[PDB]
Structures are given as structure tokens and as C-alpha cells.
Amino acid sequence: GPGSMTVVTTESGLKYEDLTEGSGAEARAGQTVSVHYTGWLTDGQKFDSSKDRNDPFAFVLGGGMVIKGWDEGVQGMKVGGVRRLTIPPQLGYGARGAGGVIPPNATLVFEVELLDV
Ligand SMILES: Cc1ccc(SCC(=O)N2CCCCC2)cc1
């Protein structure tokens, strides 16, 4: 009624959460799709807001211009759907990580919102 709430991990390691069911169409491979991305720290500190550009991030799914959690996340995400994709410190920035923005060892919380495909 009010909504669902569950967490599940994949074999790759990445994770994702349901925020808003999308009744449109799952992202296609080899095609460009516009979606909004939001980077949040372990505490909730925002370090990236696609909304800044005032437009959806249009990128080709399965091209190589994103991270594992991205390809896998969008691969399932549907138009108008919103899911919280959780990427580890290994499948994200990398062993180096950001100077002060993001720590070396920590879970990165990224929000994905499909606007169009
Ligand atoms: C603040 C900040 C500025 C530049 C970067 S690098 C962009 C990046 O690595 N992205 C991963 C795939 C989704 C789009 C963003 C990371 C953080």
C-alpha cells in the first residue's frame, strides 16, 4: 500500500535499493539514456548532483563511460524509476579515492533516476 522496502546484493558485489517503481521500460544496451545521478557519502554528504546541469545525464548504456554499478544499475532500472545504487570503495573511485571528498575505504551511496531512454 504505502510502499515496499528491501535490500539485496548481487554476485558482482554492488548493491541497489528500490525508491520508486517505474512503469515505462528498462534501459536498453548500446542506446543513449537520460538519467539523474546523485552522489552521497556514508554520512549523507552530497558530493555530486546531476541536477546542477539542470538536465538529465544522457549516456550510452554498455559503452564504457560509466562504472560497473552503473551499467548493472541502469541495465535493470526503468524509465521513471528511482533506485539507490550502492557502490563499494572498490567499484567506485578506486584504491586511490578522492582527497577529502570521499575516503579510501567506505560505502558510496549513489541515487539513480531514469527520466528517458
Ligand atoms: C565531484 C566530482 C567531480 C568529478 C568526478 S568524476 C565523474 C564520475 O566518475 N562519474 C561516475 C559515472 C557517473 C557520472 C559521474 C567525481 C566527483
Query: In the chain, what are the domains?
Result: 1-117 (3.10.50.40)
Buried b or exposed e, range 36-57, using 16+ CB within 10 angstroms: bbbbbeeeeeeeeebeeeeebe
How far apart, in whole angstroms, are the C-alpha atoms of residue 71 and residue 61? 6
Distance 87 CA to ligand 1 centre (A): 13
59 is catalytic: no
Catalytic residue among 71, 87, 102, 110: 110
Q: Which of 18, 48, 57, 59 is catalytic?
A: 48
- Judge whether 71 counts as a catalytic residue: no
Contacts of 1 (CB under 8 A, 6+ apart): none
Q: Are 113 and 82 in contact (CB under 8 A)?
A: yes
Give dist(CA 53, CA 83) in Å, integer: 21
Distance from the Cα of residue 58 to its chain's centroid:
13
Residues 59-71 as b/e (b if ≥16 CB within 10 A, e otherwise) read: eebeeeebbbbbb
Q: HSE (CB half, 13 Å, CA atoms) of 93?
A: 20
Residue type, 87: I
φ, ψ (nearest 5 deg) of residue 52: -55, -45
Longest dimension (CA), the chain: 44
Ligand 1 atom showing the smallest separation from residue 102 Cα: 17
Q: Cell 541536477, residue?
A: 51
The method recorded for this entry reads NMR
Distance CA 84, CA 15 (A): 8
**Ligand 1 probe mutation, 38, 45, 48, most atoms within 8 A of CB:** 48
Distance CA(100)–CA(20), nearest Å, equals 32
Return d(Cα 115, Cα 80) in angstroms, integer. Answer: 5
